[PDB]
Design a protein around this ligand. Sequence first.
Ligand code: HUR
Ligand code: HUR
Lengths: 299, 298
Amino acid sequence: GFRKMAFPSGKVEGCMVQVTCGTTTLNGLWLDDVVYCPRHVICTSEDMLNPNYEDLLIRKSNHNFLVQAGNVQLRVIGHSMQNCVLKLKVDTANPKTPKYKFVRIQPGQTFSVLACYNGSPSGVYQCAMRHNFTIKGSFLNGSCGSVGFNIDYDCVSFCYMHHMELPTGVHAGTDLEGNFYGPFVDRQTAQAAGTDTTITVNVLAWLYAAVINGDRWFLNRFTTTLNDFNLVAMKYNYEPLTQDHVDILGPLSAQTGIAVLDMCASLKELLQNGMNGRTILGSALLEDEFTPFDVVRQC
Amino acid sequence: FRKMAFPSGKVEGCMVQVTCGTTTLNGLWLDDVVYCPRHVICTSEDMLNPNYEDLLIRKSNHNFLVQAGNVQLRVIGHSMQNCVLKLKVDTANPKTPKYKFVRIQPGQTFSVLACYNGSPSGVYQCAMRHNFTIKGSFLNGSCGSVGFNIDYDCVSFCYMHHMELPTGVHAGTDLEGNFYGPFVDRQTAQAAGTDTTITVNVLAWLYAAVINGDRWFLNRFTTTLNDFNLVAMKYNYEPLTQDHVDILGPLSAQTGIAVLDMCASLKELLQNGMNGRTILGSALLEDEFTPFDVVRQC
Ligand SMILES: COc1cccc2[nH]c(C(=O)N[C@@H](CC(C)C)C(=O)N[C@@H](C[C@@H]3CCNC3=O)C(=O)c3nc4ccccc4s3)cc12
Ligand SMILES: COc1cccc2[nH]c(C(=O)N[C@@H](CC(C)C)C(=O)N[C@@H](C[C@@H]3CCNC3=O)C(=O)c3nc4ccccc4s3)cc12
């Protein structure tokens, strides 16, 4: 009764285009008369290991950039670079531009990813920004420039553009100002992320989700203080729960009548005892990619 | 591997609302027809056991409020086909995609665009269980939301939502109004059949594991199809059909592991267990990725 649920992607699909420079092709986002895309579209295989991006860009001319919106070619009439993003001014404004904002999200927040190849949308799914600033996505060769977003009353808040797959199989990218999430760099190197701690407030939100959907087996008659919970949480590489997190869980607490610290005592038991093979909402593991908002929005 | 829905835009452009009285359901606007669940015509005391034919005779075109947003589409004809109502409207939808109506087989996955008051709310992947239910996420007001697959810009509509069973799973029809499974559209508690594990999808999952280099479970045995099906039934696994064997063909060729050899490997896993080992990082076998999903992702 509770599923990972993406936002409808139509407003973003109408913005996806193809950007080609030489032998490199990736995806771009076309809003008004500007196409946003990863700047390493200008790199050849020789440039990848140590690209001096300003020195490479100054050598390019507008006509070196081939931008295709479906079948139609869009004429590039100017370009600028903002951090790791290239902004191509085109001679045609996108008639399907939605109301939109660029936002930089916080670890723990979720967004929808529209995975695209050759400027054509392929799939949509939810992702969470993890505490080490990676996301557990599904991206293949040619996916760069795919974007992540949230939608609120027909306004699309773009928060992610895709750049990289780490050796561990997780993914890294930038906001739409071209600043990476995390300590990653847009060069062709094998990069490791920091320690990935679990998003505690999201696990708790999902335990409330299970209760709303009629499952209570993991509850117990005990309680805990906030600091005693956090001591155990940190022992298991969970993020410490703040009073802001407790406040954010209030509505789910009030809906279910289970105090936040009572659910923390439930999670403490699950961490110390395991699930003993049983499952929660279909999962054999503690799910941490639903926010309190995601639970309320869906329930 | 992620559960990935199809991009929903081509379907968003077809969602409308249909109101009769105070009852508002979602509808699907393709060319100059709107399709919706027929019980939009029901009142509260009509729903325990509706006489839909007698209820429809008391309706006229002007009793139906069809809206795209707040814009009314005038109804110029109406008819009933199984459990769906077809309203002819005076405007052909300019956003109509290339489309087909398909009746899917159990095990197959599709994308659901959940909608409320004609307004799309979220999208997610579902598998049709072998008892013809789906594990969806649907609230009051969701009926008429549709499920679909997209192949080369052609939208194949396969599901329209009608019901939540007492067990919390969901049931509905194809776009010709024929229920999947033994369910009926009235306000009554109905039971599904046994929910078997989707064998063909577990086999697809095993192929995905082999593709990614996780192949400890491959054995040196083979089986006949009939011997496997008789064993599978004892573990609440669905018997394989010839169609299942054939849709595993591409993965079998990709890996060089014959379908029946993979069946013998799964049979061993069912009879002896995983014994603490994992496959693609999980101790549980996934049964909601189809052979197509695995190729679409690998
Ligand atoms: C020895 O180097 C490694 C060692 C160990 C792991 C590694 N990972 C990467 C790495 O990710 N590189 C970046 C590109 C860098 C420059 C940001 C990259 O290929 N992005 C992809 C999406 C990738 C591809 C597979 N699925 C993922 O999502 C993308 O679409 C782009 N393709 C190109 C092709 C040509 C020019 C620009 C781009 S941008 C390198 C690497
Ligand atoms: C004693 O009766 C029960 C006992 C035990 C379990 C039960 N389940 C149902 C049952 O499902 N009824 C159908 C309706 C029937 C007629 C197909 C129904 O409410 N469909 C919903 C989607 C539901 C709602 C909750 N989330 C689900 O997906 C839908 O959208 C529709 N709403 C209306 C409202 C007014 C008129 C038409 C429609 S059609 C009844 C029932």
